């Protein structure tokens, strides 16, 4: 048969091929050219401090044993041969649970060119960890990393490199953005050496710069707590004889601030420090509590009666102070 040539070529390739040994074992170092094609940067879990990424993680090394002279130059094959040959043991250093997909068959690419160059890509779902600092939450920006290197082979055994320019060796796809909270600002790669218990390893790093959006947070925590300060500020304009009404104002607005304080601290890590959102909740709660203390003070002095000097001074003092605080805050963080 005509196909018998192309199966006498492959059986010639995998004849005496010891796949437990890297190519050029006692002679040189296995230079592995690597690039990443991010088909979809998945959603970022703030509570778990991790992120999800779908990739077409590529590799390209050089094997002298896989050398052939056939009718075809490139020898595009299925994954079966990828289990029969030496492939690098690239694991993800900060990965937590990565899925090598296999629907409907195993999603792997293997291309042996004539000289002996290999190309071996795969579709992965790396759920990498991302250490996040949330002192300016929710106007914070993170550089979520992605570190990968060989597990067993040291720096004198397997080194890594980018196949293209390092600015163009991580290509995020155009339509791939499953991010709802963040937006992917840009790319950053680096190559370094890490020191461990067994030896030195060449580690490859991929930083993804994400800036958080506050639109949802404006709807959920900021503008409810801006209106709640204004809602308790209505009580300054009433009578001095409306004691049940103004207690309803004070109690309802303090309860609203309290439930927004509790409901603000959700879907979030239980961090020890106080975020930038907490220093808005605290000052808003201080304003509404000061309004309630002002009502208690004017009620203790209430005995026809006359308009209160405390109320008339508070009607000017409270909105200007709230505006100064809002201006200072929304320039401290937003325009940082």
């Amino acid at each position, epitope marked *: 048969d005509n196909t018998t040539v192309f199966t006498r070529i492959l059986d010639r390739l995998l004849d005496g091929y010891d796949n437990r040994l890297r190519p050029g074992l006692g002679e040189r170092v296995t230079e592995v050219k690597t690039d990443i094609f991010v088909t979809s940067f998945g959603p970022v879990s703030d509570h778990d401090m991790e992120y999800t990424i779908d990739v077409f993680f590529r590799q390209s090394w050089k094997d002298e044993r896989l050398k052939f002279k056939g009718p075809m130059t490139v020898l595009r094959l299925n994954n079966l041969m990828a289990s029969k040959i030496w492939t690098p043991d690239t694991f993800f250093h900060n990965g937590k649970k990565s899925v090598a997909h296999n629907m409907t068959m195993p999603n792997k690419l293997l291309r042996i060119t004539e*000289d002996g*160059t290999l190309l071996y890509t795969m579709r992965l779902t790396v759920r990498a960890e991302c250490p996040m600092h949330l002192e300016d939450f929710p106007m914070d920006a993170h550089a979520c990393p992605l570190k990968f290197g060989s597990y067993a082979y040291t720096r004198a055994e397997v*080194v890594y*490199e980018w196949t293209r*320019e*390092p600015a163009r060796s991580v290509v995020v796809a155009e339509d791939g953005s499953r991010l709802n909270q963040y937006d992917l600002l840009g790319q*950053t*790669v680096d*190559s*370094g050496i890490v020191q461990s218990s067994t030896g030195e390893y060449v580690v490859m790093t991929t930083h993804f710069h994400l800036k958080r959006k506050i639109g949802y947070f404006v709807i959920q925590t900021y503008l409810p707590c801006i209106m709640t300060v204004i809602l308790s500020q209505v009580s300054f304009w009433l009578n001095r004889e409306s004691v049940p009404a103004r207690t309803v104002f004070g109690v309802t607005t303090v309860l609203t601030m309290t439930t927004l304080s509790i409901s603000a601290r959700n879907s979030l890590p239980k961090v020890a420090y106080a975020t930038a959102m907490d220093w808005f909740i605290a000052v808003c709660y201080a304003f509404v509590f000061s309004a309630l203390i002002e009502f208690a003070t004017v009620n203790y002095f209430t005995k026809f009666n006359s308009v209160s000097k405390i109320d008339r001074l508070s009607r000017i003092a409270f909105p200007l102070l709230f505006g100064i605080f809002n201006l200072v805050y929304w320039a401290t963080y937003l325009n940082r």
Partner: antibody
Amino acid sequence: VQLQQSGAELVKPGASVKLSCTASGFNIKDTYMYWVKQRPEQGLEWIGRIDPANGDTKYDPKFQGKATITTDTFSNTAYLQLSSLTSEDTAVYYCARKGLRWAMDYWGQGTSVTVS
Amino acid sequence: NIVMTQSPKSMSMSVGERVTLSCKASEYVGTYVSWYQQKPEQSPKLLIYGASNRYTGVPDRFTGSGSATDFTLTIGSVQAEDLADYHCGQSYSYPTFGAGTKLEL
């Protein structure tokens, strides 16, 4: 592990000059070939970059059109062309292979072109 | 692309003391710089790759330092055979170069 170039060239301005460098001891397909321009007593300026495996050449945004870089397969050699050379094109050229961590490891021997 | 503003253009000391080079990147280049020396009638030779990696055949006195943006090259106890120009390169993008730095006695 050696880069061998051609000799010097004496051409009139407005003409075209053919210049090339040959790499021996290693195949040029796995590495990247570079080109750099050294005008005398100033810094280095990069000309362009090829790769013989793929063939998509790419140049400096202030050097396209007037300068192109080509290569072949059998002779393991990288060629280039200049178009409409001027007085500021009088310089010495080197070609450099890609090393570890993209370092421009092994350079040429120097080809100085002069105009008249 | 990436603009390199290595300083100074020329600086001179005697034989046998510390000298510190500097190179500044316009944008982010992450530990991908390269230091070359320019001997007269000679092509550039690789000295330091990455950010701080001594190439084979480089003496121990040649030591570079690296960061995201600013890079320095330090030579301890320079002598007569190191009297050459020094160039700063990069490879995080398409490769560019600096101006250079002359050394004198």
